[PDB]
Amino acid sequence: MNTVPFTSAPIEVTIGIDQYSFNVKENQPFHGIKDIPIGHVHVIHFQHADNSSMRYGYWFDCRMGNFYIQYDPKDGLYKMMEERDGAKFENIVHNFKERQMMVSYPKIDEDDTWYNLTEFVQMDKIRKIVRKDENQFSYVDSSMTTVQENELSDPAHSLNYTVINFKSREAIRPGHEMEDFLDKSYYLNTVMLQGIFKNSSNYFGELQFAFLNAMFFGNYGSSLQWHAMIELICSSATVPKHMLDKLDEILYYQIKTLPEQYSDILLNERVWNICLYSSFQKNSLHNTEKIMENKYPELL
Amino acid sequence: GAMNSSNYAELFNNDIKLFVDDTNVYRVTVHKTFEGNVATKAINGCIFTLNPKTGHLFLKIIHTSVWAGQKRLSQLAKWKTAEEVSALVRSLPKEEQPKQIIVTRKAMLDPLEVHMLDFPNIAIRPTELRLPFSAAMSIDKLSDVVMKATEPQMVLFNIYDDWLDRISSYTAFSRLTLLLRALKTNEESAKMILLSDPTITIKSYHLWPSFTDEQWITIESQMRDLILTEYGRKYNVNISALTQTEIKDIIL
Ligand SMILES: COc1ccccc1NC(=O)CCCCC(=O)O
Ligand SMILES: COc1ccccc1NC(=O)CCCCC(=O)O
Numbered sequence: 250m251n252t253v254p255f256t257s258a259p260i261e262v263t264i265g266i267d268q269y270s271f272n273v274k275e276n277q278p279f280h281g282i283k284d285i286p287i288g289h290v291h292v293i294h295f296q297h298a299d300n301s302s303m304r305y306g307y308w309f310d311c312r313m314g315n316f317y318i319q320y321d322p323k324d325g326l327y328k329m330m331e332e333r334d335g336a337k338f339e340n341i342v343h344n345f346k347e348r349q350m351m352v353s354y355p356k357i358d359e360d361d362t363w364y365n366l367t368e369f370v371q372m373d374k375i376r377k378i379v380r381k382d383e384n385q386f387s388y389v390d391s392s393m394t395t396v397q398e399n400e401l402s403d404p405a406h407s408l409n410y411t412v413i414n415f416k417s418r419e420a421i422r423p424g425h426e427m428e429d430f431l432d433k434s435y436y437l438n439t440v441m442l443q444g445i446f447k448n449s450s451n452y453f454g455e456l457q458f459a460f461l462n463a464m465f466f467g468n469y470g471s472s473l474q475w476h477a478m479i480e481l482i483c484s485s486a487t488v489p490k491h492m493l494d495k496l497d498e499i500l501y502y503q504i505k506t507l508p509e510q511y512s513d514i515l516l517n518e519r520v521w522n523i524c525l526y527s528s529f530q531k532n533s534l535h536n537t538e539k540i541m542e543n544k545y546p547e548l549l
Numbered sequence: 550g551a552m553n554s555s556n557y558a559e560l561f562n563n564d565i566k567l568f569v570d571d572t573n574v575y576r577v578t579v580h581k582t583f584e585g586n587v588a589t590k591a592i593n594g595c596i597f598t599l600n601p602k603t604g605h606l607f608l609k610i611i612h613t614s615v616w617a618g619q620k621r622l623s624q625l626a627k628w629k630t631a632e633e634v635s636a637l638v639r640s641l642p643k644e645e646q647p648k649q650i651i652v653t654r655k656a657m658l659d660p661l662e663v664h665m666l667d668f669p670n671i672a673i674r675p676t677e678l679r680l681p682f683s684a685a686m687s688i689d690k691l692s693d694v695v696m697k698a699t700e701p702q703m704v705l706f707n708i709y710d711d712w713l714d715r716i717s718s719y720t721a722f723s724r725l726t727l728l729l730r731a732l733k734t735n736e737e738s739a740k741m742i743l744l745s746d747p748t749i750t751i752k753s754y755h756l757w758p759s760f761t762d763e764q765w766i767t768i769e770s771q772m773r774d775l776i777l778t779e780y781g782r783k784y785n786v787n788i789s790a791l792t793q794t795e796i797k798d799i800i801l
């Protein structure tokens with residue numbers, strides 16, 4: 250298990266770590282999070298108590314370095330930093346553990362939720378979507394726009410998701426206009442999977458990362474990308490049969506984790522009704538259909 | 550955006566534009582079969598592509614062979630329309646290509662947009678106008694060329710005859726829409742109005758009769774009366790009791 254110590258907590262804040270959230274009071278003796286499961290990416294996120302504007306946070310993997318959080322009173326936020334002095338880091342963590350000033354990551358034993366939400370998410374792919382090469386961790390916030398949004402504005406502060414546009418020359422072969430618009434299989438299999446993502450694991454990883462940024466940061470561009478990547482598969486007549494099976498599992502756990510009171514803002518009615526009831530794959534997502542119909546029948 | 554009851558005069562400015570109407574592309578008769586089922590039989594159709602400023606009509610005849618062995622014909626017809634309009638644009642010199650294409654039915658928007666992706670500067674727009682271009686097949690010379698076709702064919706017409714020698718394109722378009730609306734509403738009565746007088750004829754190179762200016766005023770009045778008469782018959786309304794403002798609104 251690994252640890253993200255905090256220098257201190259000078260401002261009252263809600264700290265989320267993966268699907269869990271907790272509150273820290275102003276100047277409380279809080280010094281970080283321990284027992285973080287090794288083997289997955291993680292996200293540590295923040296919403297200030299006195300200013301719920303800007304959720305922000307950091308994607309990281311404790312296998313890539315020793316990371317800690319320190320508040321910056323000039324920029325007004327909790328910043329992630331890397332400690333290169335390993336013995337210093339161990340000494341700090343040991344002291345804070347001894348004084349019981351760190352909360353414990355509470356991975357319950359039966360629970361595969363985080364694995365199920367991040368199965369295909371890799372830190373190396375995150376760092377290509379979020380470009381800041383001097384850090385091993387990646388900052389995301391509520392307001393960051395995507396490259397596609399910036400085309401329809403600071404490029405250095407954008408989410409470089411793969412652009413998906415159903416009415417683009419990329420998606421439509423000359424001479425195959427009706428075929429390619431009504432059946433997205435060319436665009437999914439040749440353009441995206443063979444050409445850009447190279448395989449279904451990378452595609453699924455970006456889809457999962459987009460969902461998590463939409464849910465944890467309330468990021469609009471992320472929510473658009475997640476829905477577009479679902480609709481591209483569902484609107485293709487020809488999809489690798491296992492790929493539909495893996496998608497059903499991915500979506501099932503995303504819908505299970507989504508907060509019910511955020512269903513109005515995180516779920517697009519048009520897309521979900523098309524995918525579940527009209528699309529080529531309307532019968533291929535049995536688990537996701539059942540959870541959607543039982544948890545959010547109003548959307549449908 | 551859409552072309553409604555605010556942008557009327559835009560139709561007659563100097564930016565090249567075309568209306569596209571697909572109503573008559575896929576045309577069928579419906580009949581009982583020997584076993585008592587129902588079957589369709591396709592008949593030749595046409596795409597109606599019109600420049601409203603100049604009157605130039607690009608009538609692409611859709612021969613029934615294009616449907617042979619195809620499925621989902623009502624869907625295919627929209628994509629075939631879009632393919633043919635795209636091919637028309639590509640066939641025109643750059644200085645003759647439209648800057649806007651206005652589709653009469655919103656279901657044509659996506660097919661045409663997808664076929665025209667290589668022309669990002671040509672705007673594809675719908676319209677809130679209820680234009681009666683479906684009645685084009687009530688014009689005898691247009692119907693004749695469509696029904697006689699034995700293969701795909703494009704035929705060029707000026708739907709305004711020589712009217713622009715005497716009237717503006719605004720007035721010519723208004724006259725055309727009044728004539729087509731009357732033909733759509735009561736085809737037999739409209740044709741009787743247009744042909745009642747033997748002494749006025751249709752030139753070999755025209756679609757409509759050679760009316761003088763004053764005769765056109767009379768004809769237009771008779772067409773408005775036809776439309777009002779049919780409105781009264783349909784809705785069980787006493788048209789004689791109606792005021793001029795009420796009559797003008799109904800015709801509009
Ligand atoms: C201070 O609490 C925390 C601090 C840091 C991380 C997680 C927590 N959460 C808990 O201890 C309760 C989990 C409740 C969710 C469930 O029952 O599945
Ligand atoms: C922009 O922040 C967001 C972040 C994540 C999801 C949604 C939004 N925003 C909106 O949806 C605003 C336009 C539609 C509003 C609505 O009806 O929901």
Ligand SMILES: COc1ccccc1NC(=O)CCCCC(=O)O
Binds near residue numbers: 719801
């Ligand atoms: C500019 O013409 C138009 C432009 C756009 C839409 C419609 C029109 N015309 C008409 O509807 C003509 C019938 C009513 C006029 C009459 O009875 O003389």
Ligand SMILES: COc1ccccc1NC(=O)CCCCC(=O)O
Binds near residue numbers: 783784785786
């Ligand atoms: C078929 O008439 C219609 C159909 C649809 C809408 C309106 C109408 N017209 C009327 O309501 C006129 C009064 C009718 C008086 C009467 O009943 O004889």
